[PDB]
Ligand binder design. Structure first.
Ligand SMILES: [Zn+2]
Lengths: 18, 129, 503, 107, 382
């Protein structure tokens, strides 16, 4: 896994659910 | 390579803050000669011959100073912003120097591959057009 | 490749539906003709209606697959239209203002100016994005620092009304939608308005990171922006220096030179718009007053022949003398000489009838010449003004064709010499190479050789007759295709003037 | 040719674009608004390519090609702007220190 | 009578050193017109930053004009139009579409954030400049935030919503007997010209490109109407005018009219779109040629207000405005750009001077001679 985006935006809302 | 970036970043922030400082100097530049003239006239040896003149000169100095504090406090504020921003920039710069000089690593290698893709994508944007 | 097999199957179905080999080949020819960008889409669909129109489904697949008044400019308003109340108007504003009369209405920029406008617009867009990000960061920072001091009970019921305490409620929305995607921007704005406690810190952190990322991206793009500006701004001053360059690029095409004479004929002489005077015999007037502009141009030609990549030495030795031959024969300057009631005695007016090749060569000659005749009247003036030049421009033009001087310095050399008087000497190399190539194609062709032989025979006679001209025309037309456009050239020795006329 | 810098829209309909300009409105920058090309799933807001190389962005290699650089690194390493900034800062320092001495005396 | 006069370098007139009140606000530069829009208030911030970093603040008194109120705007505009302007927002335009089509807002007058605040601040800048010029507290008011002349009594066109120029003119007319107006913008001052056709108090001269251009009005025959006859001169020109040609076509007209009209106050528009390399302009002036007009007008020793309009390429308008501001203080400029926030936007040479283009001038001398012939003939009547 060597990404730049499409993952941190999900972790933003994933943190919201926690 | 980060040294180049911080060298570019220095003048822009420095100049923004210096322009702000120039504006603060502008809004109060017409009272410095008046204040200096009042102080010099007060410190004259042939001035104490009328008490009312001393009172009125002190009143004028007090009024000028009451008008002059706001510019000084705004100057402190902008200079503090200058100091903290420059502190951050220098921090970045000297971490960059230390890293570049310690070894005359795979994470920063990956950024080359990530940028190589962008360079490859932009080079092919002219061939394919 | 994902969206190709479907098209292959569709075309196979179309071919099977046609069923005819010859009709299928005709359809293949139609689609190949369209593939050369010669057939319009409407024409293509109207044509395929004839072939595949029988099959409605395949035709539909193809169709959806290929797609009182006073003054000149002022009118008096009527009495009913004069009542637009204004509460701020006092007596003076009523007396000294007008409410009865209302006014009524009745250059190609250089490509590099457009590039500079695009660069400036891109820079301003980046600057506006950064400034909006800064304002939104400040607003979110003050909101976060206000809510952090607030208790937990007020945090739980904290609701953010639209506006965010900003001078413009729409300022931060654009920044939020730019940082996120357009589909999630509305959701993020609603969450900020409804759950500020959990949304403000994380969105502020995102803004803080994006500010640094955008600043780094701007400073990275500034390298290319600086290089573009440095390499384009200097060129973006000569509006005449580049427009005339492209005009010279597009002018010396075979069709265009004959287009000039045909147009002037059909406009002035053939049409007879005046309808009062007979049409003039000739069309264009040219003069050859100076003869020193011949040796230098011949030297330029010999330089090109001695520097050209693709020419043989037996060809070069011929070319080194052909130019001398035409100059000596035409301008009377210095069979063996050739290789080196209508009867009028001692004729001074001579006629040359030839095909497009000689006409194009002569037009190249004259287009090169009028570029040098215009600077004749200004050489002394610019020599006076520079110290407050013909040899200098000659030696500067020498070094380009032989390759001593690069192309760039030629343009800037003449700029200081002539600010706006000279803007036609910047493409001498191209016209010279066109002229030498056209001379080569004159000499090589056999039909052109016969035309030049007929011209030689006609010119060698010092006395002409009425029937001799007709015989010359018939002889030049004997080997000449009728469809070719006929031209005629007449050169006057008395005034050293060469005239032309379109037949 | 493209029509840029005309506010007539009378006989220029023939030219490229020029359908967005008219005598009625003032704006005439619309014809040179950049167009987009979708490459690698993303748009790009597009002979400058031959005159100016774009691939000069490539990062320096570790063999110290600092002096022989891409016309951009030398611009920053040779920029004397830091010295001018230092002089301006120290001039402001002197201008403030004169006043500082003045208030020190007055105190 | 038109005669050819070669251009000469500008030197200040040390005869007078009148006070300069450069009105400015820091919130004007925040407003934006759009994404692809050419009109940007950011050029005002660019010019102000150039002034600040240049060292010109020690001579001029910088102010911050109070925004104008609705009642002040009603001195010239209609209550309905100003009400719509205040009420309209970039969000509720659908409910205001009737007024938008009626008041001509949306095509060249886009609705953006703080639009009413922009109009109010420009009107207040012009109003306060006129107030200072009327009370004798100053003699030059550089209201660079104004320069909005295309707006009409009940219409907004040409990126021009509130006509602050006529408001300042009315303020001057509060106690002045006669006022005069000048233009340098490539377009025509339709609203300002029309505002005072029938009256002698105000004169409106515009040096506007004519023909198939944006305003399409202001021919040589726009003499006037009623008692305002011969009191509104126009000098239509053509594409490609240069510095010397502009000077020769500008100076004699002003000299003649101020000999005849004898103005008691002066206002001078300073449109920056009439320069070389401009986006929406068709001239070839330089900063020297642009500053020539303001220097010439100032040399006559009359109370003048300089407003700032136009300008659609940042560098040209910023440098021109800085040069005009410097020359209004009878100070020649250094002509070298000091480092500031926008140093990267100032060309590849970072020099204050911008070289005018080489493009072909079109104004024939005989046409200009005839134009000033009609101008002088109609001005001689009064
Ligand atoms: Zn304008």
């Amino acid at each position: 896994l060597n990404p730049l985006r499409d993952s941190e935006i999900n972790d933003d809302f994933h943190q919201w659910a926690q | 390579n980060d040294i180049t970036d911080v060298l570019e970043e220095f003048p822009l922030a420095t100049s923004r803050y210096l322009t702000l400082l120039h504006e603060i100097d502008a809004k109060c530049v017409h009272s410095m000669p008046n204040l200096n003239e009042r102080i010099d006239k007060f410190l004259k040896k042939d001035f104490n011959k009328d008490h009312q003149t001393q009172v009125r000169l002190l009143n004028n100095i007090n009024k000028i100073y009451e008008e002059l504090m706001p510019s000084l406090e705004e100057k402190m504020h902008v200079s503090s912003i200058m100091l903290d921003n420059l502190d951050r920039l220098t921090s970045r710069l000297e971490l960059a120097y230390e890293v570049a000089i310690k070894n005359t690593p795979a994470m920063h290698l990956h950024h080359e591959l990530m940028e190589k893709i962008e360079s490859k994508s932009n080079s092919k944007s002219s061939q394919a057009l | 490749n994902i969206s190709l097999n479907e098209e292959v199957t569709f075309f196979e179905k179309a071919k099977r539906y046609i069923g005819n080999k010859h009709l299928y080949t005709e359809f293949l020819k139609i689609l190949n003709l369209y593939s050369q960008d010669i057939l319009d889409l409407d024409d293509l669909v109207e044509k395929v209606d004839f072939y595949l129109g029988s099959n409605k489904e395949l035709f539909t697949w193809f169709k959806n697959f290929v797609g009182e008044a006073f003054g000149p400019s002022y009118k008096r308003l009527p009495k009913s239209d004069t009542f637009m109340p204004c509460s701020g108007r006092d007596d003076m504003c009523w007396e000294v203002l007008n409410d009865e009369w209302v006014g009524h209405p009745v250059h190609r920029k250089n490509q590099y100016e457009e590039t500079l406008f695009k660069i400036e617009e891109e820079r301003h867009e980046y600057d506006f994005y950064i400034e909006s990000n800064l304002r939104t960061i400040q607003c979110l920072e003050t909101i976060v620092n206000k809510i952090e001091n607030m208790t937990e009970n007020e945090k739980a019921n904290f609701k953010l009304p639209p506006g965010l305490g900003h001078t413009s409620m729409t300022i931060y929305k654009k920044v939020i939608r730019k940082v996120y995607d357009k589909e999630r921007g509305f959701e993020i704005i609603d969450a900020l308005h409804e759950h500020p406690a959990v949304t403000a810190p994380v969105v502020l952190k995102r803004l803080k990171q994006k500010d640094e990322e955008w600043r780094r991206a701007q400073r990275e793009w500034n390298k290319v922006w600086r290089e573009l500006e440095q390499k384009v701004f200097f060129k973006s001053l000569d509006h005449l220096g580049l427009t005339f360059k492209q005009a010279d690029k597009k002018l010396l095409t075979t069709k265009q030179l004959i287009s000039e004479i045909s147009s002037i004929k059909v406009d002035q002489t053939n049409k007879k718009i005046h309808w009062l005077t007979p049409k003039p015999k000739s069309q264009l007037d040219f003069d050859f007053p100076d003869k020193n502009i011949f040796y230098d141009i011949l030297c330029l030609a010999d330089t090109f022949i001695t520097h050209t990549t693709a020419y043989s030495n037996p060809d070069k030795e011929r070319l080194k003398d052909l130019l001398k031959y035409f100059i000596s024969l035409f301008f009377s300057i210095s069979l063996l000489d050739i290789l080196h009631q209508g009867i009028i005695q001692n004729r001074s007016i001579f006629n040359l009838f030839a095909n497009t090749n000689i006409y194009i060569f002569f037009r190249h000659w004259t287009t090169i010449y009028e570029r040098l005749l215009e600077i004749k009247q200004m050489n002394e003036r610019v020599t006076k003004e520079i110290n407050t030049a013909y040899k200098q421009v000659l030696r500067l033009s020498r070094r380009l064709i032989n390759g001593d001087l690069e192309h760039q310095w030629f343009e800037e050399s003449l700029r200081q010499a002539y600010n706006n008087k000279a803007f036609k000497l910047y493409t001498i190399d191209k016209v010279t190479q066109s002229l030498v190539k056209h001379a080569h194609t004159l000499m090589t062709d056999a039909k052109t050789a016969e035309i030049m032989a007929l011209f030689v025979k006609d010119r060698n006679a010092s006395t002409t007759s009425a029937k001799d001209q007709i015989i010359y025309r018939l002889q030049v037309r004997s080997h000449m295709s009728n469809t070719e456009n006929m031209f005629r050239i007449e050169f006057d020795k008395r005034t050293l003037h060469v005239s032309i006329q379109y037949i | 040719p493209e029509a840029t810098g005309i506010s007539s829209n009378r006989g220029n309909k023939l030219l490229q674009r020029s359908e967005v300009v008219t005598r009625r409105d003032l704006n005439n920058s619309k014809p040179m608004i950049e167009q987009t090309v979708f490459y690698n799933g993303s748009e790009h807001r597009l002979d400058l390519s031959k005159l100016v190389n774009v691939k000069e962005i490539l990062t320096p290699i570790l063999s110290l090609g600092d002096i022989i650089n891409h016309k951009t690194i030398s611009r920053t390493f040779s920029s004397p702007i830091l010295k001018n900034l230092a002089l301006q800062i120290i001039l402001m320092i002197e201008k403030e220190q004169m006043s500082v001495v003045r208030y020190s005396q007055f105190l | 009578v038109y005669e050819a006069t070669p251009f000469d370098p500008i030197t200040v007139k040390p005869s007078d050193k009148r006070r300069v009140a450069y009105f400015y606000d820091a919130d004007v530069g925040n407003y934006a017109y759009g994404a692809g829009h050419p009109m940007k208030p950011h050029r005002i911030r660019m010019a102000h930053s150039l002034i600040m970093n240049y060292g010109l603040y020690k001579k001029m008194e910088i102010y911050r004009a109070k925004p104008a109120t609705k009642q002040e705007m009603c001195q010239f505009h209609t209550d309905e139009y100003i009400d719509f302007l205040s009420r309209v927002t970039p969000d509720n335009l659908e409910m205001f579409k009737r007024e938008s089509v009626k008041f001509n807002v949306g095509d060249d007058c886009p609705v953006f954030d703080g639009l009413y605040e922009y109009c109010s601040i420009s009107g207040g800048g012009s109003m306060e400049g006129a107030a200072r010029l009327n009370r004798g507290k100053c003699d030059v008011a550089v209201n660079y935030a104004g320069g909005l002349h295309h707006a009409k009594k009940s219409e907004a066109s040409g990126f021009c919503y509130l006509n602050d120029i006529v408001l300042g003119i009315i303020e001057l007319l509060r106690y002045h007997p006669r006022v005069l107006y000048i233009d340098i913008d490539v377009h025509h001052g339709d609203g300002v010209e029309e505002a005072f056709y029938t009256t002698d108090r105000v004169m409106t001269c515009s040096f506007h490109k004519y023909g198939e251009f944006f305003p399409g009005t202001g021919e040589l025959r726009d003499i006037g109407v009623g008692a305002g006859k011969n009191y509104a001169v126009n000098v239509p020109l053509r594409d490609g005018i240069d510095d010397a040609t502009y000077r020769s076509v500008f100076e004699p007209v002003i000299k003649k009219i101020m000999e005849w009209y004898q103005p008691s106050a002066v206002v001078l528009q300073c449109g920056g779109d009439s320069l070389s390399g401009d986006r929406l302009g068709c001239f070839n002036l330089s900063m020297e040629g642009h500053a020539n007009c303001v220097n010439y007008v100032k040399s006559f020793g009359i109370p003048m207000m300089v407003v700032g309009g136009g300008g659609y390429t940042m560098r040209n308008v910023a440098r021109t405005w800085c040069f005009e501001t410097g020359l209004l203080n009878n100070v020649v400029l250094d002509k070298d750009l000091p480092y500031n926030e926008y140093y990267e936007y100032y060309g590849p040479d970072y020099k204050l001077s911008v070289r005018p283009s080489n493009m072909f001038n079109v104004n024939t001398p005989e046409y200009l001679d005839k134009v000033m012939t009609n101008i002088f003939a109609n001005l001689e009547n009064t």
